[PDB]
């Protein structure tokens, strides 16, 4: 599963670097160049989504009220609820990833940094499991970079 590996690599690095400010220097791996451009597209579009919709996102975060490990469960089920809908497009996908980064920042502030990687895997698992066909047809993360050129 190369799509899953690449998706996790992109989403995990974005969430961690958004939460800590630290960039991960380790090599990518297979299809490394496309992942680096996806991540650059993600910083550009995703940082913007977070800035331009901080009020809405914070109200959403407030609803989830995340103060402990068990609260962290609710986050994946929101992901499942969306991706279980039949509609698929890159705007939904980048928006859910961006909300993941917003919640990752929170988790760091609440001394739950160890929860960020599981959060990233849950996002990746749901995205790839539920939308594999659609993603494949866009040429995976190459379509993402080209859609947001």
């Amino acid at each position: 599963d190369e799509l899953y590996r690449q998706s996790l690599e992109i989403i995990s690095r974005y969430l961690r670097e958004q939460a800590t400010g630290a960039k991960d220097t380790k090599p990518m791996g297979r299809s490394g160049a496309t992942s680096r451009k996806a991540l650059e597209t993600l910083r550009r579009v995703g940082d913007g989504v977070q800035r331009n919709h901080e009020t809405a996102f914070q109200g959403m975060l407030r609803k989830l009220d995340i103060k402990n490990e068990d609260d962290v469960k609710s986050l994946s089920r929101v992901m499942i609820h969306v991706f279980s809908d039949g509609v698929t497009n890159w705007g939904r996908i980048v928006t859910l990833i961006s909300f993941g980064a917003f919640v990752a920042k929170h988790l760091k502030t609440i001394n739950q940094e160890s929860c960020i990687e599981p959060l990233a895997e849950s996002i990746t698992d749901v995205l790839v499991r539920t939308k594999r066909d659609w993603l494949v047809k866009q040429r995976g993360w190459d379509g993402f970079v080209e859609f947001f050129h």
Partner: peptide
Amino acid sequence: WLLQSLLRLGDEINAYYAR
């Protein structure tokens, strides 16, 4: 109806870049 607010926001963002 949080779910529906996120979907709605994502569809907005999709429309903007599809133009």
